[PDB]
Design a protein around this ligand. Structure first.
Ligand SMILES: O=c1ccn([C@@H]2O[C@H](COP(=O)(O)OP(=O)(O)O)[C@@H](O)[C@H]2O)c(=O)[nH]1
Ligand SMILES: C[C@@H]1O[C@@H](O)[C@H](O)[C@H](O)[C@H]1O
Lengths: 25, 294
């Protein structure tokens, strides 16, 4: 099994690593 | 009563240039740079200049101090107005804040999973489905009431993911899968509900007001500095730059009493250490997140 997180390899859809803000649901 | 003010016995430059660094245990390359030493020395210098004014009665409230931190930090942005706005705006209670645990935050995944206080939980996802997550739930205690803070989550059936993510991508589009992972990454920090920040902010003026005593011993001062650091960093009051501001403020109060804290140790990112601990834990571990070696 992959490292924690490393399931997210070469995914163009990988989030960017900084704080994002979103409207509450 | 007035206070000593910043010391004249300054840290060696090599240490100035590491004030407010983010010395990741997985990439202290950025700590060594010309720009980042430039950034850090500037913070060093503007902390003392805030230092100067706490001593004189100039800065009356933690919010005023936080302003000085914000003014400093903004003048270091060479970025523009979306980004400027963020570093300058408090988080508003109609939003949530989220940090995905991708680079440069990978060192954190381990910190959550081997964390004594971690739970094992189930996190129910619209695209991936159900997930086992290791979960650290930072909580403060204030007045005796419990205030949830930041919630770390690391997804742990990794094989299933890389499969399922790859699967999910092609249908909705990376476009539509990115969307999801910006906000719902299996591995992520969910930050303090912006709703708690008025009462935290009140709490911080209380601490600030206390720590600009004259009568306090060295111990009880450092305690009150670690705390102020602890609360401000963990509340994350602003959309961006909270870590920088927390450290700046925590240090400005130090200098107002004539203390000269050293950089933080390597691999010891101050706001993460704070986020991943409870208050009294952090207060007691504080002096040693600091590089206090001659
Ligand atoms: O060019 C920079 C910008 C920031 N930092 C530090 O790295 C952390 C980044 O957090 P900050 O709150 O500045 O911004 P954000 O994390 O929201 O991007 C803080 O400890 C900053 O002092 C740094 O070393 N160099
Ligand atoms: C990295 C972490 O979450 C993000 C914020 O912008 C903040 O500076 C920091 O505390």
């Amino acid at each position: 099994a992959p490292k924690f997180g490393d399931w997210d390899e070469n995914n163009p859809s990988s989030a960017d690593g900084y704080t994002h803000i979103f409207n509450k649901v | 009563r007035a206070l000593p003010g910043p010391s004249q016995r300054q840290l060696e430059v090599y240490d100035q240039c590491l004030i407010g660094a983010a010395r990741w245990p997985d990439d202290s390359s950025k700590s060594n740079t010309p720009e980042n030493r430039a950034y850090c020395q500037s913070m060093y210098n503007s902390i003392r200049s805030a230092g100067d004014e706490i001593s004189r009665g100039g800065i009356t409230s933690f919010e005023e101090l936080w302003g000085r931190a914000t003014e400093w930090r903004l003048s270091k942005l060479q970025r523009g107005e979306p980004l400027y706005s963020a570093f300058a705006s408090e988080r508003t209670s109609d939003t949530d804040a989220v940090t995905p645990l991708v680079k440069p935050y990978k060192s954190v995944l381990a910190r959550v999973v081997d964390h004594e206080d971690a739970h094992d939980e189930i996190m129910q996802d619209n695209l991936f489905g159900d997930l086992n997550v290791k979960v650290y739930r930072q909580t403060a205690y204030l007045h005796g009431n419990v205030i949830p803070l930041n919630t770390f989550r690391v997804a742990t059936d990794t094989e299933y993911l890389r499969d399922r993510v790859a699967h999910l991508r092609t249908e909705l589009g990376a476009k539509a899968l990115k969307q999801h992972l910006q906000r719902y990454n299996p591995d992520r920090i969910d930050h303090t509900n912006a709703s708690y920040l008025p009462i935290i902010k009140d709490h911080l003026n209380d601490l600030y007001r206390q720590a600009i005593s004259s009568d306090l011993s060295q111990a009880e001062l450092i305690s009150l500095i670690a705390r102020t650091h602890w609360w401000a960093a963990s509340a994350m009051p602003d959309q961006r730059g909270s870590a920088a501001k927390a450290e700046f403020a925590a240090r400005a109060i130090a200098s107002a009493h004539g203390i000269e804290l050293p950089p933080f140790r390597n691999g010891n990112v101050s706001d993460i250490e704070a986020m991943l601990s409870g208050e009294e834990e952090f207060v007691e571990k504080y002096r040693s997140l600091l590089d206090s070696d001659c």
